[PDB]
Structure formats: structure tokens, C-alpha cells
Write a protein that binds this ligand. Structure first.
Ligand SMILES: Nc1ncnc2c1ncn2[C@@H]1O[C@H](CSCC[C@H](N)C(=O)O)[C@@H](O)[C@H]1O
Ligand SMILES: [Zn+2]
Ligand SMILES: [Zn+2]
Ligand SMILES: [Zn+2]
Length: 424
């Protein structure tokens, strides 16, 4: 029994709208990807399937590239890894770009003929390409891949015979770039990327009515606010820690459009975001580029090296409420956590609590998780009174964003009751 529908929008291709009244936290759609892969960063640190930060990863006997959590995970992924395994062995040790490997996976999937439940609303051939509205460096970037693609797929693909006809590579990639989704783990860390054709119908907003969470590679679409019938459905395409400017910039450079959202048009919260001295945070912003490099690759130690310096450096001057300051804290935290310096972790993250409340308005999965992490630490620290507070708060947020359908709730409840037992 369905709850939404496809339609041609005002001026922007297609889109998605409701067909019933929808309350907060309602589960609207649910999909496995059509194709997905572990992104370069997390490669060789999470499983090419369940996508989970783990112990002892056995690597495909054949290619010796793909890594797997269990013997079952390996077996399950095999339908996909089947063909690529070959090429990955030839690339060794040169490893192909995510978007390339991803495409390989979509090629093969369209070459079995499975009525993929991810395409139930919009096929792959229906996806926007923006061919006519692309720049030149962009177009020249695309021809790049096609070349790198064909060298990579030498082993399995010799010519357009083995491709589904009415199918252009150059075109395909265009679809990829603006139709891809960043997959995150429980701790809202980016671990892989995939295409979710039915979900791609959702359009952008900087203050949207819908969220997406990932239970491993499995995607959940939920409502976040009360929605009246016939209303267009939107998610945010971006991180919420950006300025009206930054947002516009990427959207042009990646999706090829100018934003409509109220917020974009009236520089919403932009003052607060940049509150402070430009000269300080102009340097801070720069350092972060090299820092986040060492985050996607899980270099932790090295990130903390850089982080701790800057927070102690501009401790006298720059407030927590500034985004760049905050971003550092956020990192400083995720560092200490993966290092074990939990006392330190807490001391930091606890300071991100207030800014987050402000920047992540309503019910946002990121805020929830953050709160959870912070409460979880307090619980570890034995600050049960303050812990119970956040855990509850976090629950109250996540009961909307995740639902009983996401396994992380099961884990959060258990934390609540454990905290309970220490208040006995
Ligand atoms: N909020 C928004 N404002 C303007 N254009 C948008 C948008 N969200 C998506 N688009 C554009 O819609 C075009 C594709 S039309 C087909 C899929 C698309 N996501 C859709 O809206 O149906 C793309 O150029 C994409 O950037
Ligand atoms: Zn292999
Ligand atoms: Zn696994
Ligand atoms: Zn906007």
C-alpha cells in the first residue's frame, strides 16, 4: 500500500509528492541500492558488504582486493563482485575511482534483468544527466573517466556488444555525479556510495521535510515534520554546516542549479555561523582541508595532532558557535573516541551540544547521533544523571529519524536501561 507519487515539477524535470497525510517519523520508502561500493577512504577498513568497522577481514582469494567481515558476507556480495573481481586483480595496486567501480556495478546489474526494487519508481535511464547544462572542466572531467573506465573494464568489456544498447558511457557518468548518495554508518561516518533510482526523485531543500538514514547499505526514507497531502517531498543534499554561499557553490558545481530554499535566499543563520574574527577562521578553514583527508582514510592519531593545536591555539578568542571552530571540535572528538582518550572526547563533544541544537533544527539524524555519542560517553564516564538526559533526548530525536526499523534504536534502548540500572 503506497504513500507517494512521481510527477513533473514546476520547471525541474520530475519530483516526488505525498498522497496521504504524513505525520513526523513516518516510514515512507525503504530501498536497497541498485549498485554500491565502499568508497576509497573506508576501503580495506570496512566490509565490501555489510560495511562495518571490524576485526579480521578476509580478502577475496582471487582478486586479493575486496575485504569481507564474514564468510556469509563474501557469499552474499559475490553476485556483484563476480565480474569486477577480475579487473581489480589487473589494477593491483592501482585502484580505480569510486564513480568508476560503481558504474561497473550498474552495468552488470542492468545486464542480468532483475526488476530491481530500487527502481520501482524511476529507472536508471530516467535519471537526470544534465548534459546540456554542464560546464567544460566538468565535461572534460567526464571524458577522463570514460577512458579510465574502459582501460579498467578491459577484462570484461571489449565493446558495446556487451553493453545494453541505447546506453552511452559519457552520459551514464553524468547521471552518476548528480544522482549518487553518500552512505554512512551508525556513527554517521561516510563509508561508501550508491545509486538509489527511486530516491533520486526527491528534490533539494536546505530546510526539507524528509530525511535519509542508512542501516548498513540499506536506506530508510522517513518524514521529519507534519506533511499535508499533495506537497512535494524534499531532503537536503548537503551537510548542514555550510553557509548560503558554500551551498550555492557546490549545487552549481555538482547539480547545476541555484537554490530556492527560503534559507538560501535570506542568508539564514549565516551571521551566527561566522560569528567571530575572519582572520582567525580564514586560516582555520584552510587547515581543515588537510585534516579531513586524514579522516576519511582513518588516520586518527594524525588528525588529533593537528586538531588539539588549533583549539588550544584559539582558546582565548574564537567561540564554539562558529562552524569552523565547531568542525574541529567535532573532529577532535571522533579522534579521541577512536583513540580511547574518552575523558578528552567528552570534554570536547559536550561543547558541541549547544551549537548543534541550533544548527540542526527539528529532528535531524546527525544531531541525534551526536547526542547519543555524547550521552554514551557520559554513561561510560559514570555521569548517569546527565547521561539519562541526553540518551532520552537522543531517543526522542531518533525515534523520528531512524524508527524501530533501524537497528541502532535497539542498541539505544539497551543503553537507556543500562544507565537506569546505575541509578537503580
Ligand atoms: N531543489 C532543486 N532545484 C532545482 N533543480 C533541482 C532540485 N533538485 C534536483 N534538481 C535537478 O533536477 C534535475 C533532474 S530531473 C530528474 C531527477 C531529479 N532529481 C528530479 O528533480 O526529478 C537535475 O538537474 C537536478 O539537479
Ligand atoms: Zn575478488
Ligand atoms: Zn560484512
Ligand atoms: Zn537553499
Amino acid at each position: 500500500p503506497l504513500k507517494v507519487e512521481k510527477f513533473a515539477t514546476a520547471n525541474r524535470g520530475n519530483g516526488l509528492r505525498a498522497v496521504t497525510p504524513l505525520r513526523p517519523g513516518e516510514l515512507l520508502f525503504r530501498s536497497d541500492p541498485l549498485a554500491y561500493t565502499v568508497c576509497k577512504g573506508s576501503r580495506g577498513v570496512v566490509c565490501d558488504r555489510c560495511l562495518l568497522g571490524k576485526e579480521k577481514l578476509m580478502r577475496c582469494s582471487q582478486c586479493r582486493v575486496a575485504k569481507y567481515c564474514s564468510a556469509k558476507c563474501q557469499k552474499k556480495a559475490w553476485p556483484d563482485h563476480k565480474r569486477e573481481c577480475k579487473c581489480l586483480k589487473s589494477c593491483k595496486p592501482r585502484y580505480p575511482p569510486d564513480s568508476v567501480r560503481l558504474l561497473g556495478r550498474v552495468v552488470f546489474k542492468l545486464m542480468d534483468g532483475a526488476p530491481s526494487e530500487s527502481e520501482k519508481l524511476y529507472s536508471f535511464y530516467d535519471l537526470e544527466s544534465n548534459i546540456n547544462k554542464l560546464t567544460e572542466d566538468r565535461k572534460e572531467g567526464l571524458r577522463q573517466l570514460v577512458m579510465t573506465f574502459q582501460h579498467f573494464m578491459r577484462e570484461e568489456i571489449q565493446d558495446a556488444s556487451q553493453l545494453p544498447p541505447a546506453f552511452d558511457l559519457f552520459e551514464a557518468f553524468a547521471k552518476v555525479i548528480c544522482n549518487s548518495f553518500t552512505i554512512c554508518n551508525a556513527e554517521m561516518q561516510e563509508v561508501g556510495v550508491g545509486l538509489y533510482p527511486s530516491i533520486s526523485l526527491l528534490n533539494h531543500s536546505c530546510d526539507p521535510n524528509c530525511s535519509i538514514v542508512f542501516n548498513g547499505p540499506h536506506l530508510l526514507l522517513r518524514a521529519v515534520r507534519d506533511i499535508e497531502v499533495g506537497e512535494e517531498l524534499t531532503i537536503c543534499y548537503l551537510d548542514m554546516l555550510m553557509t548560503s554561499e558554500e551551498r550555492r557553490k557546490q549545487l552549481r558545481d555538482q547539480y547545476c542549479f541555484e537554490c530556492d530554499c527560503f534559507r538560501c535566499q535570506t542568508q539564514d543563520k549565516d551571521a551566527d555561523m561566522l560569528t567571530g574574527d575572519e582572520q582567525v577562521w580564514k586560516e582555520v578553514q584552510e587547515s581543515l582541508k588537510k585534516i579531513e583527508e586524514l579522516k576519511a582514510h582513518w588516520k586518527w592519531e594524525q588528525v588529533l595532532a593537528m586538531c588539539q593545536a588549533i583549539i588550544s591555539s584559539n582558546s582565548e578568542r574564537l567561540p564554539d558557535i562558529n562552524i569552523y571552530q565547531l568542525k574541529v571540535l567535532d573532529c577532535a572528538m571522533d579522534a579521541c573516541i577512536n583513540l580511547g582518550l574518552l575523558e578528552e572526547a567528552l570534554f570536547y563533544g559536550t561543547r558541541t551540544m549547544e551549537p548543534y541544537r541550533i544548527f540542526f533544527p527539528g529532528s535531524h539524524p546527525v544531531r541525534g547521533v551526536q547526542v547519543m555519542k555524547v550521552g554514551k560517553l557520559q554513561l561510560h564516564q559514570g555521569m548517569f544523571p546527565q547521561a539519562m538526559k541526553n540518551l532520552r533526548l537522543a531517543f526522542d530525536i531518533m525515534r523520528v529519524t531512524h524508527g524501530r526499523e533501524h537497528s541502532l534504536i535497539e542498541d539505544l534502548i539497551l543503553l537507556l536501561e543500562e544507565c537506569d540500572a546505575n541509578i537503580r
